[PDB]
Amino acid sequence: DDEINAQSVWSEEISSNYPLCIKNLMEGLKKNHHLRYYGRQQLSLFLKGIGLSADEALKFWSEAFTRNGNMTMEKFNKEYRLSFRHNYGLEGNRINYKPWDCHTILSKPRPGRGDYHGCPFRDWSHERLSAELRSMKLTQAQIISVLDSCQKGEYTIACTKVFEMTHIAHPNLYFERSRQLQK
Numbered sequence: 001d002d003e004i005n006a007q008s009v010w011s012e013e014i015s016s017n018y019p020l021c022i023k024n025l026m027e028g029l030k031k032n033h034h035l036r037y038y039g040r041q042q043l044s045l046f047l048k049g050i051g052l053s054a055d056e057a058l059k060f061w062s063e064a065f066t067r068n069g070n071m072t073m074e075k076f077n078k079e080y081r082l083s084f085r086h087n088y089g090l091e092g093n094r095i096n097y098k099p100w101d102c103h104t105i106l107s108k109p110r111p112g113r114g115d116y117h118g119c120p121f122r123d124w125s126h127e128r129l130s131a132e133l134r135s136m137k138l139t140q141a142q143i144i145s146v147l148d149s150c151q152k153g154e155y156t157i158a159c160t161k162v163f164e165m166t167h168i169a170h171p172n173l174y175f176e177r178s179r180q181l182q183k
């Protein structure tokens with residue numbers, strides 16, 4: 001828990017390693033104090049995959065959902081705690097819950113209004129993507145190349161370009177490669 005814990009996953013140091021999908025999920029969670037089902041699964045299983053323990057995951061999700069008075073702890077415990085425990089096997093289930101790879105993410109239902117799951121290289125408009133990439137210090141020529149990949153449907157290549165420019169396709173591989181480059 002020394003490096004990956006409920007508090008450090010909100011740090012800039014750790015979150016600088018997140019791919020765009022995880023950044024988007026963390027932003028929706030930070031702003032709305034909630035995520036709908038597919039986003040809860042995408043994010044919680046990514047965080048389990050980077051080493052967030054069961055106890056630290058319950059801290060993370062309970063604090064995020066009850067922040068700013070969004071819901072009481074009693075409501076969290078009655079309506080969400082079991083679902084997060086289930087994703088960690090803590091009620092004894094033996095289902096496979098491995099982190100989702102990019103193909104799995106892309107194959108989930110596309111996000112609608114109020115959804116943060118999916119792949120931003122597909123799901124965002126070029127103008128939203130461009131603004132995000134500018135905030136990550138990419139230049140116009142870089143952005144044009146990333147958008148070219150997006151328009152061709154090559155979302156994982158777009159994401160690989162972003163990795164290269166800011167330093168099997170899998171968000172956890174993006175994280176691990178980026179985090180290794182901090183060490």
Ligand code: SF4
Nearest residue numbers: 019021102119159171
């Ligand atoms: S390509 Fe994969 S890791 Fe990158 S933003 Fe899309 S789903 Fe996430």
